[PDB]
């Protein structure tokens, strides 16, 4: 499978656009948090289907598939959040009916910290002009590189995706020196997605322990795990 066609399958594995079915209106602490949690739960369902459409993913032992998703789910959600917000500077497009601002994240203690992180990283990807195909590979890599017979299968898959990202960059038509610099800069931004991730989950866990948000079944499980 050539890099170009692997990237295609990733385009086909893309989950559908999700909405929380919420009528426009100001956000209170309760509505915002229940909205973010409800949205995450819906997306998690689509994330599982997405992963399975990644060539070779279902070939991995059930134990690996589970460990990979249980560890990277939040990062993948936020990577999707950042690609959706790329064209809307100063805003976080969690969903069509869930667009938030930095100041609106002030009604919830500790979340403003995170909105700022999500906005800075998003702003960074914006400057670099992240391309759709680059986004596809990066998100795939986030899932396949979260490993903290099946093992060889993983490395081979991660390698294929890495090989696909290098290809995408190569098509851009820029200098070789600039291809390496772009590859390094895109990959380094991952650490930033991962950090906003750990903070986002630490915050959610706290919210759960306080039964302040309805932690739906799939979301709770992923959280506890």
């Amino acid at each position: 499978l050539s890099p170009e066609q692997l990237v295609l399958t990733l385009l086909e594995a893309e989950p559908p656009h999700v909405l929380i079915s919420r009528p426009s209106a100001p956000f209170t602490e309760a509505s915002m948090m229940m909205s973010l949690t409800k949205l995450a739960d819906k997306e998690l369902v689509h994330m599982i289907s997405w992963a399975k459409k990644i060539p070779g993913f279902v070939e991995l032992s059930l134990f690996d598939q589970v460990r990979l998703l249980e560890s990277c789910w939040m990062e993948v959600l936020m990577m999707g959040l950042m690609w959706r917000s790329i064209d809307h500077p100063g805003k976080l497009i969690f969903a069509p009916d869930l667009v938030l601002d930095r100041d609106e994240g002030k009604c919830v203690e500790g979340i403003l910290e995170i909105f700022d992180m999500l906005l800075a990283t998003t702003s960074r990807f914006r400057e670099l002009k992240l391309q759709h195909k680059e986004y596809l590979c990066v998100k795939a890599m986030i899932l396949l590189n979260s490993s903290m017979d099946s093992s060889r299968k993983l490395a081979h898959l991660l390698n294929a995706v890495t090989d696909a990202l290098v290809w995408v960059i190569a098509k851009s038509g820029i200098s070789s020196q600039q291809q390496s610099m772009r590859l390094a800069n895109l990959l380094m931004l991952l650490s930033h997605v991962r950090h906003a991730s750990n903070k986002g989950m630490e915050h959610l866990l706290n919210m759960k322990c306080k039964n302040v948000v309805p932690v739906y079944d799939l979301l709770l499980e992923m959280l506890n795990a």
Binding site: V45, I48, S49, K52, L62, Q65, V66, L69, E70, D217, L218, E221, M222, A225
Partner: peptide, 10 residues
């Protein structure tokens, strides 16, 4: 076990 049932069904 929500994750596993979705990983084994379509």
């Amino acid at each position: 076990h929500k994750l596993v049932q979705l990983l084994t069904t379509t």
